[PDB]
Design a protein around this nucleic acid. Sequence first.
DNA 1: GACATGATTGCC
DNA 2: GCAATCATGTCA
Length: 199
Amino acid sequence: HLTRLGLEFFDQPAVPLARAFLGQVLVRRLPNGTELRGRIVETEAYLGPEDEAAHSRGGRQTPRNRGMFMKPGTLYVYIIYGMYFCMNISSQGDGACVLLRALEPLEGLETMRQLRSTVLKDRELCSGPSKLCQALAINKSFDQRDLAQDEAVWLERGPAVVAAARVGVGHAGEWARKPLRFYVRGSPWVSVVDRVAEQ
DNA sequence: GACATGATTGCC
DNA sequence: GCAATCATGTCA
Ligand code: NA
């Protein structure tokens, strides 16, 4: 609470926000009062209407993705492949948000392991957008919550960034190629390294 | 109402 | 290399 990043932090455009997320710690307070912690090491920016890789492309706006259009810091959690969740945080700009792709586990590792068992090496706990949601017990109920004012989840300030193309956007179009994915260089917790982009 | 599909994960 | 599994986006 005293460390929780507030409203002013989130009110930034997608790219600066996605880059600013690196190093920050995502915290999840479970019912047993225990708190799980993960330092963000990989994120992706979705610019909005012009961004053909975003759900909000062409100004598309529905009840499912309303979060992207809500105040910065508002969560947009959705179900993919009818089996996994993806956690995004609305940024400045309607239809713009930041997807979280990987965290470096810091605390509550044992609970995460249990959560993701449905023996896992720590490297398999949060190395992915859906894995991290599973590891932190994030689900559809976290959709549209305010990361700056929620009792169960918040971001804390943390004490070389690689910019690469996003994952699972395809190999067609200028937007699929744009370097809108950012992660901690040399980090062993990133979900997908891009040796090419690192050079 | 119907029908194609996914910013993944993980086993063959 | 590809199946799992179903809410959502579209078209009607
Ligand atoms: Na937004």
